[PDB]
Amino acid sequence: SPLHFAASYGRINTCQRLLTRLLNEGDLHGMTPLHLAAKNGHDKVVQLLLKKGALFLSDHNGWTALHHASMGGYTQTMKVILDTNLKCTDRLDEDGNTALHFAAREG
C-alpha cells in the first residue's frame, strides 16, 4: 500500500527508501507500481522502478504501463518506457487496442 501510493503520486524519495514480490505486485485492479507511476505521469519514478528490474506486466484489462502513459499523453514517461524495452509498443489490451490507439483516441 505505501509503495503503491508513493508510485501513484510520484513521491520518489519514498520509493527509493521502500526499495522482488513488492516491485511486481498489483492491487484489486492488477496495477503494479510501474502501472500507477506511468498512469499518473511520473517519469522519474518509472525510470527508477525500471532500473530496479521491474517487468512490463499487464493489469486486469490487459493494459501495459505504456498503455497508461499514452492514455494520459505523458510523453516523458513514454520516452522512458520506450528507451528500455522495445517490445511493449505493440502489446494488445483486452479489446485489441494498443498504446497508439489510446493516444489517438484521447487526442
Binding site: 510520484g10 513521491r11 520518489i12
Partner: protein, 39 residues
Amino acid sequence: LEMEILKQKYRLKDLTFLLEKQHELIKLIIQKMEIISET
C-alpha cells in the same frame, strides 16, 4: 455574434491553460507533501 463567440473561445483557452498549470502545481504539492499521521 461571431466576435463575442471568438472572444469567449479565447477566454476559455486561457482558462484551460491556467487550470493545467494549477493541476501541475497541485500534483507537485502531493509529490513534496509530508504524510505522517495519515500514512
